């Protein structure tokens, strides 16, 4: 084996002499600068990069990659020995734990207690990432790189590093460094005075003196497309500690550098985990309307309705007499009609959204669920956005009541263990439904065709029947497009809706009077020709205010009401 003293001096030489042609080629010696910041307590963790080491000594890099734990300890001791040379300044007292250390120094006048920094390796660029299936037992103890998806994360917990006790009789203190996942505490004083006199003094543990570190537990899983044919995906446990905590999130793609090790017992076969050293994450109105689903011919005003669904209205909030701004709409489709393309286009387009289907498949439902913590739910995962329901007509009573509760309160409840937990569901709803049998029949009402109950079905601001039928030129055009596809700016739109949705336009009393006259005349025609109700008025308000938000204007105007009126009026024509 190597002489680790010689290796220590080599590591010191690297820290003392290396410059990356750094600070725009001024050769300011990056690690020397870092040691100054560390000495003056400006910074806690230090990521040493193995590509830098490779410039001087590739054999050292190879030495590190196998049995990495030795070199972790070695580099940490080297940094502690060199730190006073880069100090020039006295640091202000800022921590109770360090106030105890200061008192200890004042009274005196192990190193692990004082070592307030963290040292980690950034993997060499030679090492391509392995999949969770290729980290076999020949890699125990070696530095590895892995790629996958996060599934679960715990809260941050305090992990014990060194314990500090005080003695009732002799007034001394004792220390106990911790390394294994468990330990056994001290009881009676080992100091010479107490021992020689057998005076029996007891030891009291001090949470004001002992040292703790931030600790968090995580799980990571294989990508589905990487799994070989006819197999179930696997998972690996990752332990996060120190300044690496709170980076990762559930459902997020990550690449992790770490050491692969076996778990300590308390048989010859043992479980393993990955010790993390670094975590890396992987006019305007007509133009925007024409930008929605250009693959689909016609349906000009339906695209504008979906645009305003994405833009939204305003929450009025007059002292609890609430009117909400979220638009909600529903599409009734004939069998096999083009609605799937439009639906998926809005799903793809929207910056925050989710999709589900009403049949109640083997996966998790519309609401959250429990496993052995709470998780999931399409209604939950779309929150500051829009959620889309497919084949709505096949929903169950549980689904209908869940949608009803979301429409009223925009929140849900699921019982973890009998406790009445409750959970945010702030999103807008988009529904897709199909008639009970065959094509829609114009001789019968929409309730008779689609057969959802009228109470919740009438919640939607707009209802559209997507009916279509053969024609030679249109079918030929469609076939030409599909066969052509088989043979051979969203950023601006997102920024536009980002800036324009800052507006919350009001209405003046003149517009309220105008709306009053228009609404009563509309209801007169509605009963003379009924479906009209207060919901209709609030829908008009929502769509007109949404259009006012689409403009860069601080108030609604006559044209906004007129546009909303023709949109709600003409929607009936789709049913006939």
Q: Could you list the residues known to form a binding site, using ranges.
A: 297, 336, 338-340, 434, 459, 535
Residue 484 contact partner, candidates Zn ion, other proteins, none, CB within 5 to 8 A by sort of partner: other proteins
Residue 254 pairs with which residues in a beta bridge?
Answer: 148, 281
Rounded CA separation 71/466 (Å): 67
For position 485 contacting other proteins by CB under 8 A, the verdict is yes
Residues 150-189: x/- map of binding to other proteins (CB under 8 A)?
Answer: -x--------------------------------------
| Minimum separation from the CB atom of position 44 to Zn ion (A) | 35
- Residues preceding discontinuities in the chain at C–N > 2.5 Å? 109, 266, 282, 372, 488, 529
Minimum distance of other proteins from residue 565's CB (angstroms): 35
Give which of other proteins, Zn ion, none residue 483 binds (C-beta under 5 to 8 Å, depending on kind).
other proteins
Only segment of 75-83, 168-176, 420-428, 485-493 that touches other proteins (CB under 8 A)? 485-493
Q: Which is nearer to other proteins, 247 or 349 (CB)?
A: 349
Determine the Cα–Cα distance for residues 240 and 247; give it in Å rounded to an integer.
Answer: 9
Task: With CA atoms as reference, report the closest residue to 326 among 412, 431, 404, 427.
Answer: 427
Residue 483 sits in the site that holds other proteins (CB under 8 A): yes
376 binds other proteins (CB under 8 A): yes
In the bound state with other proteins, the residue whose beta carbon lies nearer, of 235 and 316, is 235
> Which residue, 189 or 380, is less far from Zn ion as judged by CB?
189
Number of residues that bind other proteins (CB under 8 A): 43
Query: What whole-number distance in Å separates Cα of residue 96 and Cα of residue 184?
Result: 26
* Least distance to other proteins, CB of residue 284, Å: 24
**Residue 227 makes contact with other proteins by CB under 8 A:** yes
Asked if residues 70 and 78 have their Cβ atoms less than 8 Å apart, the reply is: no
Interface with other proteins (CB under 8 A), residue from 193, 233, 493, 494: 233
Among Zn ion, other proteins, none, what binds residue 167 when CB lies within 5 to 8 Å by partner kind? Zn ion
Subset of residues 194 to 223 that bind other proteins, contact rule: CB under 8 A:
221
Half-sphere exposure of 297 (CA within 13 A, CB side): 9
Cβ of residue 495: shortest distance to other proteins, in angstroms? 21
Q: Which residues contact 135 (CB under 8 A, 6 or more apart)?
A: 144, 146, 236, 260, 274
Contact, 456 vs 407, CB < 8 A? Answer: yes
Does position 375 interact with other proteins (CB under 8 A)? The reply is: yes
C-alpha to C-alpha distances, 194 to 141, 166, 188, 190, nearest whole angstrom: 44, 13, 9, 7
Shortest spacing between CB 242 and other proteins, in angstroms = 27
Tell me if 364 contacts other proteins by CB under 8 A.
yes
Among 171, 351, 438, 453, binds other proteins (CB under 8 A): 438
* Tokens describing residue 382: 């779309």
Minimum CB separation from other proteins for residue 106, in Å? 52
Query: Which phi and psi angles does 278 have, rounded to 5°?
Result: -165, 135
- What is the nearest approach in angstroms of Zn ion to the Cβ of residue 192? 9
Contacts of 463 (CB under 8 A, 6+ apart): 329, 330, 332, 446, 571, 575
Q: Choose from other proteins, Zn ion, none: what does 201 bind? Cβ within 5-8 Å by kind.
A: Zn ion
Distance between CA atoms of residues 298 and 345, nearest Å: 15
Look at the block and give the residue holding tokens 């949608």.
403
The answer to whether residue 469 forms part of the interface with other proteins (CB under 8 A) is yes
Which of 179, 472, 527, 576 is in the footprint of other proteins by CB under 8 A? 472
Q: Tell me if 335 contacts other proteins by CB under 8 A.
A: yes
* Closer of 201 and 333 to other proteins (Cβ): 333
By 3-state DSSP, what share of the chain in percent is helix, strand and coil, each rounded to 5?
A: 40, 20, 40
Nearest residue to Zn ion, scored by beta-carbon proximity = 189
We find the least distance from the C-beta atom of residue 405 to other proteins, in angstroms, to be: 21
Separation of alpha carbons 331 and 462, rounded Å: 9
Residue 491 contacts other proteins per CB under 8 A: no
Helices 534-550 and 284-291 cross at an angle (nearest 10°) of 110
Q: Which stretch binds other proteins (CB under 8 A): 45-53, 62-70, 230-238, 494-502?
A: 230-238
Burial code (b: 16+ CB inside 10 Å, e: under 16) for 234-273 equals eebebbbbbbbbebbeeeeebebbbbbbeeeeeeeeeeeb
**Closest approach of Cβ 175 to Zn ion, in Å?**
14
Least separation in angstroms between residue 198's CB and Zn ion is 11
- Give burial (CB, 10 Å; 0-12/13-18/19+) of 104: middle
Closer by beta carbon to other proteins, 348 or else 558:
348
- Give yes or no for a contact between 446 and 460, defined as CB atoms under 8 angstroms apart: no
Q: Where are the alpha helices (DSSP H) in 382-471?
A: 397-409, 446-450, 454-457
From candidates 25, 110, 320, 470, binder to other proteins by CB under 8 A:
470
Residue 170, contacted partner among other proteins, Zn ion, none, CB below 5-8 A by kind? Zn ion
Annotated binding site for ATP: 297, 336, 338-340, 434, 459, 535
| Closest approach of Zn ion to the CB of residue 165, in Å | 10
Give the C-alpha distances (Å, rounded to integers) separating 528 from 521, 522, 571: 11, 10, 18
Binding site for Zn ion (CB under 5 A): 167, 169-170, 189, 191, 194, 201
Specify whether the CB–CB gap between 310 and 289 falls below 8 A.
no
Task: Identify what 191 binds: other proteins, Zn ion, none; CB under 5 to 8 Å per kind.
Answer: Zn ion
The answer to whether residue 361 forms part of the interface with other proteins (CB under 8 A) is yes
Q: Where are the alpha helices (DSSP H) in 18-166?
A: 22-25, 30-39, 50-56, 58-65, 68-86, 96-108, 111-114
Residue 524 site contact among other proteins, Zn ion, none (CB < 5 to 8 Å, cut-off depends on kind) = none
Distance CA 507, CA 376 (A): 40
Helix spans in 109-209 (H): 111-114, 192-197
**443 scored as a contact of other proteins (CB under 8 A):** no
Using CB under 8 A, pick the residue from 33, 272, 291, 344 that binds other proteins.
344
- What is the contact surface with other proteins in residues (CB under 8 A)? 151, 221, 224, 227, 229-233, 235, 335-336, 344, 348, 359-364, 369, 371-372, 375-376, 434, 437-438, 469-472, 475-476, 478-480, 482-487
């Amino acid at each position: 084996l190597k002489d680790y003293a010689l290796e220590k001096e080599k590591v010191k030489k690297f820290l003392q002499e290396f410059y990356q042609d750094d600070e725009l080629g001024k050769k300011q010696f990056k690690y020397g600068n870092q040691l100054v910041r560390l000495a003056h307590r400006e910074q806690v963790a230090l990521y040493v990069d193995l590509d830098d080491v490779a410039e001087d000594d590739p054999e050292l890099v190879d030495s590190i990659c196998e049995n990495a734990r030795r070199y972790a300890k070695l580099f940490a001791d080297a940094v502690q020995e060199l730190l006073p040379q880069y100090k020039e300044r006295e640091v202000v007292n800022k921590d109770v734990l360090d106030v105890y250390i200061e008192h200890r120094l004042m009274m005196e006048q192990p190193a692990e207690l004082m070592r307030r920094f963290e040292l980690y390796f950034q993997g060499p660029s030679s090492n391509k990432p392995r999949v969770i299936r290729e980290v076999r037992a020949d890699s125990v103890g070696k530095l590895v790189t892995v790629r996958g998806i996060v599934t679960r994360v715990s809260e941050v917990k305090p992990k014990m590093v060194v314990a500090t006790y005080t003695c009732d009789q002799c007034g001394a203190e004792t220390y106990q460094p911790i390394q294994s996942p468990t330990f056994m505490p001290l009881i009676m004083c080992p100091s010479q005075e107490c021992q020689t006199n057998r005076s029996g003094g007891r030891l009291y543990l001090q949470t004001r003196g002992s040292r703790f570190i931030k600790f968090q537990e995580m799980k990571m899983q294989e990508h589905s497309d990487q799994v070989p044919v006819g197999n179930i995906p696997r998972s690996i446990t990752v332990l996060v500690e120190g300044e690496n905590t709170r980076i990762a999130q559930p459902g997020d793609h990550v690449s992790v550098t770490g050491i692969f090790l076996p778990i300590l017992r308390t048989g010859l076969l043992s479980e393993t985990y990955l010790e993390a050293h670094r975590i890396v994450k992987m006019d305007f109105y007509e133009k925007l309307a024409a930008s929605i689903a250009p693959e689909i011919y016609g349906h000009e005003d339906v695209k504008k309705a979906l645009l305003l669904l994405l833009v939204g209205g305003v929450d009025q909030s007059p002292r609890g007499m609430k009117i909400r701004g979220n638009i909600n709409i529903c599409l009734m489709g004939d069998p096999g009609v083009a609605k799937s393309q439009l639906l998926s286009y809005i799903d793809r387009l929207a910056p925050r959204s989710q999709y589900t289907t009403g049949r109640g498949s083997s996966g998790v439902g519309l609401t959250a669920a429990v496993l052995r913590t709470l998780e999931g739910g399409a209604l939950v995962l779309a929150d500051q956005g829009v959620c889309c329901i497919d084949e709505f007509d096949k929903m169950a009573e549980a689904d209908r009541t869940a949608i009803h509760e979301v429409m009223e309160q925009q929140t849900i409840s699921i019982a973890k263990a009998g406790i009445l937990t409750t959970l945010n569901a702030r999103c807008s709803i988009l529904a897709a439904a199909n008639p009970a049998y065959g094509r829609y029949n114009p001789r019968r009402s929409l309730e008779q065709n689609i057969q959802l109950p009228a109470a919740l079905l009438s919640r939607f601001d707009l209802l559209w029947l997507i009916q279509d039928r053969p024609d030679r030129d249109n079918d030929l055009r469609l076939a030409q497009h599909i066969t052509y596809v088989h043979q051979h700016d969203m950023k601006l739109m997102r920024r536009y809706i980002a800036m324009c949705r800052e507006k919350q336009p009001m209405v003046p009393e003149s517009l309220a009077d105008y709306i009053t006259a228009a609404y009563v005349e509309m209801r007169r025609e509605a009963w003379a020709s009924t479906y009209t109700s207060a919901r209709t008025l609030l829908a008009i308000l929502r769509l007109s205010t949404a259009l006012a938000r689409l403009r860069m204007v601080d108030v609604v105007e006559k044209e906004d009401v007129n546009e909303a009126i023709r949109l709600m009026e003409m929607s009936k024509d789709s049913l006939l």
